Amino acid sequence: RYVKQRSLLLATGMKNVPELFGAIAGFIENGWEGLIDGW
Amino acid sequence: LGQCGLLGTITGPPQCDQFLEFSADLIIERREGSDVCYPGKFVNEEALR
Amino acid sequence: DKICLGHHAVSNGTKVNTLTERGVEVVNATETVERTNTPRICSKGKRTVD
Amino acid sequence: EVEKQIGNVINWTRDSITEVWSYNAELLVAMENQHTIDLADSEMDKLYERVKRQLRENAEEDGTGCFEIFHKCDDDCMASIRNNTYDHRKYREEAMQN
Amino acid sequence: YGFRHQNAQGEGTAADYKSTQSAIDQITGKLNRLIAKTNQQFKLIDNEFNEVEKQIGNVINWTRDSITEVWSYNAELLVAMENQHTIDLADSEMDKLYERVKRQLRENAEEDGTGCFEIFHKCDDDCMASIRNNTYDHRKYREEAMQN
Ligand SMILES: *[C@@H]1O[C@H](CO)[C@@H](O)[C@H](O)[C@H]1NC(C)=O
Ligand SMILES: *[C@@H]1O[C@H](CO)[C@@H](O)[C@H](O)[C@H]1NC(C)=O
Ligand SMILES: *[C@@H]1O[C@H](CO)[C@@H](O)[C@H](O)[C@H]1NC(C)=O
Ligand SMILES: *[C@@H]1O[C@H](CO)[C@@H](O)[C@H](O)[C@H]1NC(C)=O
Ligand SMILES: *[C@@H]1O[C@H](CO)[C@@H](O)[C@H](O)[C@H]1NC(C)=O
């Protein structure tokens, strides 16, 4: 279908923290590169 | 265009005489705008308007 | 005693459009609008008359 | 050159249809960003809800996401909560005094 | 939001700082994406003074009504999420406050039911100036909070 705008997107997962309940950087406020398989 | 009708600007009936060669970014036409003076109509006139 | 924890992180995310915000740090995206045509009439499998 | 009046109607209908599909384009994306946040949230409580159940009188809740084990724990003890083989009846006489 | 302490000195309704204005910050964001940008120009397909032909005029009216029914349908769906998008911000501050208050005072509370912490030690005004602005020493007062 024809459209006017020239880019529209998606994701796979997490909003990113550099080192709707508040879990990504919450009281666990931080991230990793410690484990490397999952999130 | 007031009492001029917008298809009269290429014919010039006697109320479009101040309008024959206008130049506008907004044309305005009125309910009392009669496109003609001699009674008649333009064929396929909504393509022309 | 104390056995501490967290979760992962990565070092580059990119923009998106929400309802209420512009340009977040989100890891991926892909275009939903294709811009790149194939500049040739691809007619395998159809008998074709140019 | 299709005729001007229908050509106007076609262009007006195509533009109107264009305005509809383009309007619909930008609403589909905003939920998928939302549909990714919850999965971190629904795992965050999942981990939170798991860790307070397998070790019963053996913790106080933290603020950093880290439990303080109320008894001695070496590597053979590390192999009990990680793979669902912890005996939370056997170590409770000594975790009350710690 | 709010901060409130009360003691044997006085009574006060204060503010607790690290999110208290931030109810502008996603609240400023909703509204221009919503009060959006219209840029397409629409011409004059039909005439209100004299009579486009009936068949195309029916097609125009049917197409305009059909388009009208689409835009009117789309009108009433945009609003219902924004009511939802306001409830979460009270919720995401409610746990934020809840998650803050159990961390700065460690062995100094039992959780309430009314949203009120019972401080396990003596606290006057100089003690009120410790948790409110992130200057509380939760190592120093713990020998006496275990006995209370
Ligand atoms: C993101 O999308 C790209 C698209 O090609 C894919 O190759 C990649 O595996 C995805 N994930 C990450 C973490 O980059
Ligand atoms: C309809 O719009 C196109 C642009 O996509 C333009 O080239 C064409 O001349 C228009 N047709 C009429 C009849 O105005
Ligand atoms: C941990 O659990 C797995 C099954 O999930 C089991 O096979 C294994 O023997 C357990 N212990 C260790 C030390 O891996
Ligand atoms: C189209 O609907 C309008 C009402 O908006 C009406 O005045 C007009 O007569 C209709 N046109 C035809 C050709 O039926
Ligand atoms: C509270 O914190 C502020 C900074 O946020 C600091 O300047 C001030 O000295 C502290 N104490 C009092 C009593 O305001």
Side-chain angles (χ1 to χ4, degrees), chain E residues 112-131:
Chain E
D112 209 17
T114 61
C116 176
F117 275 12
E118 51 100 12
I119 301 296
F120 265 164
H121 58 277
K122 288 168 94 288
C123 198
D124 53 356
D125 288 330
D126 187 76
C127 167
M128 305 305 169
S130 67
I131 174 169

Side-chain angles (χ1 to χ4, degrees), chain E residues 14-28:
Chain E
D16 189 51
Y17 179 73
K18 51 185 60 62
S19 60
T20 304
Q21 290 294 321
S22 184
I24 191 163
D25 193 78
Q26 197 257 315
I27 294 303
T28 186

Side-chain angles (χ1 to χ4, degrees), chain D residues 1-12 14-15, chain E residues 43:
Chain D
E1 57 101 22
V2 290
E3 192 271 325
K4 192 72 71 178
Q5 190 169 4
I6 40 185
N8 284 314
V9 176
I10 289 161
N11 267 328
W12 180 63
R14 182 181 292 115
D15 285 325
Chain E
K43 197 176 175 180

Side-chain angles (χ1 to χ4, degrees), chain E residues 52-54 57-58 61 64:
Chain E
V52 290
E53 192 271 325
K54 192 72 71 178
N58 284 314
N61 267 328
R64 182 181 292 115

